[PDB]
């Protein structure tokens, strides 16, 4: 538990957990799908790397829906539906065992 | 913080003095007072008002009648008809008046008003008997 070693306060400035502090990689949005295999293989799949990628995404979502001053109830409704959707797919085996239509 | 205004037509005891506890014998029950008490008022009865100041000093003040009022601003106004410390009282005198009161009760007969006065003096005498012997 520490600040990432790629972070430099002299060039970047103060730390911001929603900004990637490594080498500036081209994001997947502008990949023309001919470099998709190269882009996926280049990005490592360490447990450390994906955990940092989750936190950098989570703080991006905090920066868009909570950290602004006038943060409404919309993030806290999005989380509830997001968790309900995710947990319905987990409990799909118990839910689909009952169903309503015999043929459908 | 409990302002005390225990006065009397004869003497004056406290004037806005901080008291930890005062127990008052009233007609609504011989209850007690602590700072920021219940907003209420009640009528005194013959009994032993006690004073327990911030130093914990215990002082006993027998009264014969009066009024007790506690306001919402933690202001206590106890006014009594003749408040005296109980040390200058006699249990023998208390029973002498009590025996005199019993004679008034027995000799009242059809005089229901005199019967009430005998009952009233009986209550005062019994109050002083417990006051002086305690």
């Amino acid at each position: 538990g520490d600040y990432p070693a790629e972070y430099n306060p002299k060039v970047h400035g103060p730390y911001d957990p929603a900004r990637f502090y490594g080498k500036a990689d081209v994001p997947l949005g502008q990949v023309k799908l001919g470099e998709l295999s190269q882009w996926l293989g280049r990005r490592n799949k360490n447990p450390q790397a994906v955990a940092a990628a989750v936190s950098r995404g989570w703080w991006r979502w905090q920066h868009k829906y909570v950290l602004p001053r006038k943060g409404g109830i919309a993030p806290y409704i999005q989380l509830i539906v997001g968790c309900s959707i995710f947990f319905y797919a987990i409990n799909y085996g118990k839910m689909v065992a009952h169903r309503q239509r015999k043929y459908h | 913080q409990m302002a005390f205004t225990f006065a009397a037509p004869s003497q004056v005891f406290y004037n806005n003095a901080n008291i930890r506890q005062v127990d008052v014998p009233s007609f609504s029950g011989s209850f007690g007072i602590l700072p920021a008490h219940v907003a209420t008022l009640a009528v005194l009865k013959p009994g032993v008002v006690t004073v327990y100041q911030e130093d914990g000093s215990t002082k006993k003040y027998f009264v014969s009648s009066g009024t007790v009022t506690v306001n919402d601003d933690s202001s206590v106004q106890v006014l009594a008809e003749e408040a005296v410390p109980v040390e200058n009282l006699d249990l023998q005198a208390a029973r002498d008046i009590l025996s005199k009161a019993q004679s008034d009760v027995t000799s009242a007969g059809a005089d229901m008003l005199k019967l009430a006065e005998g009952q009233i003096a009986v209550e005062v005498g019994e109050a002083l008997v417990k006051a002086a012997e305690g």
Partner: protein, 37 residues
């Protein structure tokens, strides 16, 4: 109560209550407190 039931005013009750209190002031304070009128 007995006082109201016998139709006796509380002021009359007060005077009876204080007279019995004053009669139990034997040692020194009976004459000093009672100044009559």
């Amino acid at each position: 109560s007995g006082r109201r039931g016998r139709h006796v005013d509380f002021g009359a009750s007060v005077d009876f209550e204080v007279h019995m209190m004053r009669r139990a002031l034997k040692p020194e304070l009976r004459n000093e407190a009672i100044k009559r009128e």
